[PDB]
Amino acid sequence: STIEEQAKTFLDKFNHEAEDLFYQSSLASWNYNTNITEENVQNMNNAGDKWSAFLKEQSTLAQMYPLQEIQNLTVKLQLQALQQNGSSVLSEDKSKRLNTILNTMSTIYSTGKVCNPDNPQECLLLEPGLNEIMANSLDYNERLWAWESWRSEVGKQLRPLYEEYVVLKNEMARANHYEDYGDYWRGDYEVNGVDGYDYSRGQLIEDVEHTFEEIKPLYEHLHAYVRAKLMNAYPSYISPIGCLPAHLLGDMWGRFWTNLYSLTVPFGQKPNIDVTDAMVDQAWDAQRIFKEAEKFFVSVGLPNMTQGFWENSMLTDPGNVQKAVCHPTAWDLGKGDFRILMCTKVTMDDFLTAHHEMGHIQYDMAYAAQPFLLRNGANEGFHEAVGEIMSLSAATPKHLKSIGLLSPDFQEDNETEINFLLKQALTIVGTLPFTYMLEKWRWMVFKGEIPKDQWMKKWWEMKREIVGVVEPVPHDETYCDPASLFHVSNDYSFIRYYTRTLYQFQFQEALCQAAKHEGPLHKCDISNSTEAGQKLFNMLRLGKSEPWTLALENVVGAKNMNVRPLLNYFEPLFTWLKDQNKNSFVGWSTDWSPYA
Amino acid sequence: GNYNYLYRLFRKSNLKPFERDISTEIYQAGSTPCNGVEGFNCYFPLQSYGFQPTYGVGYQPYRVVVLSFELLHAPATVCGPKKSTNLVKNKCVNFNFNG
Ligand SMILES: *[C@@H]1O[C@H](CO)[C@@H](O)[C@H](O)[C@H]1NC(C)=O
Ligand SMILES: *[C@@H]1O[C@H](CO)[C@@H](O)[C@H](O)[C@H]1NC(C)=O
Ligand SMILES: *[C@@H]1O[C@H](CO)[C@@H](O)[C@H](O)[C@H]1NC(C)=O
Ligand SMILES: *[C@@H]1O[C@H](CO)[C@@H](O)[C@H](O)[C@H]1NC(C)=O
Ligand SMILES: *[C@@H]1O[C@H](CO)[C@@H](O)[C@H](O)[C@H]1NC(C)=O
Ligand SMILES: *[C@@H]1O[C@H](CO)[C@@H](O)[C@H](O)[C@H]1NC(C)=O
């Protein structure tokens, strides 16, 4: 009869058929991931093509129902999600060219092998051959060689491809009634139709700058301390007044600073909180690790894992005969099937990763009651944030003592808390200027603020201004230095890490206030608190049905992303860094003073 | 995937108690006539289930048997099994033989 009832029946048919097709596609992807064989690749490709064609046909049917004659918020949200053209609005030639460009960039990044000139008989893949060198080497010219050679090969291959990519994506976005591709990415956080809780695409950039202005003093102090320590490690390369050399940050691109903990440790003399040896002595299997994580989640009041999770997940490396992807990934296959694919080792990192992925599984389980097209996070930040809060809570010494992994007579003094907070800052705080600079640069590229001949001159200028990292040697326009990273080369949004980082500490403060913890924020554990789990599950059950602003009001009581919980988390470390930087100079100069 | 189990997804009106609907006519959700072809606003009302052994407990197949008990003026013949106490003789007992 009415338009709304027609849309409701169409959405019911879409949900029912899409859930089964999504299950078949997800199962094919799972079978490929746990068993890398050519028939599994073919089945995955067939299922993906069926899924994409079905989404195209359903979007084509969905557009025939006008949005303004529907008043129900959930129905309008699902219709808005379904009615997006995607690449369909673009011409078939340009769509095929864009798909070919994306596939060839994926192959170039995945199968990119670079090695030293004069020794070309065998070469190393970036995933283990170069990651270990970047994370563990102490030699200046070796790291410089690896960094420059990989950016030379990858950038020189990808620069025309990226030039075509920006034009095609901008054309598709303007064909989809967006200002640019950056506006298309920012449309994920757009809330329309809710009184008071509306959020605009233009507000996101302003909020990111407003938060980053408060991030800047803490990052300046951390950068000064890391600069002083790297000056101790490398005597002549680093200048007291200039930026840090790019190839010395402990990772390939500068994404994380967590590999500099050994060089920049405050108190090396004091012991660490490593619990690896305790699990090795007691012979802790990966099954025991996941059971302890499940015990943590039932302690806070969340539901425990299903029988199908334990039966169908692969939590151990299969063997030599069977090949599998080693990256830990939580799979929501659909229809209540939740699995974790992780090659779990007996390490602290794998244990925290197990908590993070089980948090992903809990988030997936919570919105199972919702309709299929609303089975996602309210934004991209929440989905990662709910895993990161478990990663925060599990790493505390109180949690390790509670589960028996740490000695009950371990002395928790201020020095161990300072070095632990510094490690957490290197992992968490250090990625924020890099993320903000990369997203702002990509937004300016899509918007047309930066012409194609001036991409790199601005980019390094941004990196000196924001990240405080100087190029070793100047790069011309033949290089494509951003696209060496996995997310940007494969058409992925990058602001999710920034939003995840702020939401992580906001959720942490909310749950610790719920759990009535009375001490420092970093000393807080959310185990044994039913009310904190209930407060979390109230937001978790909503999924994408409600706006992220309303969900944030439900958890932290604020209508916008906030930077104050992060500063509160690192406040002892902030005071310690302010004390330690009296002799040294906080801040950097954008000039070429160290090396160029 | 076991697609041998079907369920009705759309009907114009709710079913009456103890009603079976085995009609396979195209459901008309819109003003336009379906004309017997599944196109726009016209869907087939019977949809298949896709039972798999790796499913969650809320999606696994459950066999349901509903027993309906009614009493009508006809002689009731489906009776429960009246238990029989062993027979004791030569003592003053309370006997109940076939009512
Ligand atoms: C993996 O694939 C091989 C190749 O067909 C097959 O023999 C084996 O049974 C598969 N293993 C699993 C666990 O699916
Ligand atoms: C929107 O539709 C759903 C079912 O599609 C219904 O359960 C919900 O109550 C509706 N909301 C309003 C405000 O009518
Ligand atoms: C999708 O594309 C078609 C044809 O280009 C257009 O008529 C329609 O308005 C588009 N839908 C949206 C939501 O932009
Ligand atoms: C989850 O918890 C319930 C009750 O707390 C228990 O009966 C069930 O066995 C648990 N699930 C698993 C897979 O152990
Ligand atoms: C730890 O506390 C002691 C005692 O107050 C103090 O002397 C020391 O400087 C503190 N260390 C740090 C790193 O704050
Ligand atoms: C939380 O509850 C578990 C189960 O009762 C218990 O073993 C653990 O000690 C509790 N945590 C603390 C910090 O007491």
Residue-wise DSSP of A438-469: HHHHHHHHHHTSS-GGGHHHHHHHHIIIII-E
Give the separation between CA A232 and CA A532, rounded to whole angstroms: 45
Helices A530-542 and A496-514: angle between axes, nearest 10 degrees: 140
* Beta strand pairing call for A329-334 and A244-245: unpaired
Give, in degrees to the nearest 5, the angle at Cα A205 between A200 and A211.
Answer: 115
DSSP annotation of A404? T
Give the separation between CA A225 and CA A583, rounded to whole angstroms: 11
Give the separation between CA A155 and CA B30, rounded to whole angstroms: 55
Contact B55/A337, CB-based, under 8 Å? yes
Give the separation between CA A562 and CA A502, rounded to whole angstroms: 7
Question: Are A202 and A182 a contacting pair, CB within 8 Å?
Answer: no
Which of A348, A516, A529, A323 shows the shortest CA–CA distance to A427? A348
Give the separation between CA A516 and CA A514, rounded to whole angstroms: 5
Interface probe, candidates B27, B54, B60, B62, chain A, greatest A C-beta count within 10 A: B54
**Helix (H) or strand (E) run with residue A279 in it:** helix A276-282
Question: Are A396 and A572 a contacting pair, CB within 8 Å?
Answer: no
Nearest CA to ligand 1 atom 13: A35
> Residues followed by a break in chain A, C–N over 2.5 Å?
none
Give the separation between CA A7 and CA B43, rounded to whole angstroms: 12
Nearest-by-CA chain A residue for B59: A335
Q: Is A270 on the interface with B (CB under 8 A)?
A: no
Contact A16/B29, CB-based, under 8 Å? no
Question: Are A7 and A14 a contacting pair, CB within 8 Å?
Answer: no
Q: Which residues contact A171 (CB under 8 A, 6 or more apart)?
A: A90, A94
**Helix (H) or strand (E) run with residue A388 in it:** helix A380-394
Phi, psi of A338 (to 5 degrees): -125, 125
Give the separation between CA A79 and CA A10, rounded to whole angstroms: 10
Give the separation between CA A12 and CA A3, rounded to whole angstroms: 14
Question: Are A447 and A179 a contacting pair, CB within 8 Å?
Answer: yes
Which of B3, B49, B60 shows the shortest CA–CA distance to A308? B60
A544 is an annotated ligand-binding site residue: no
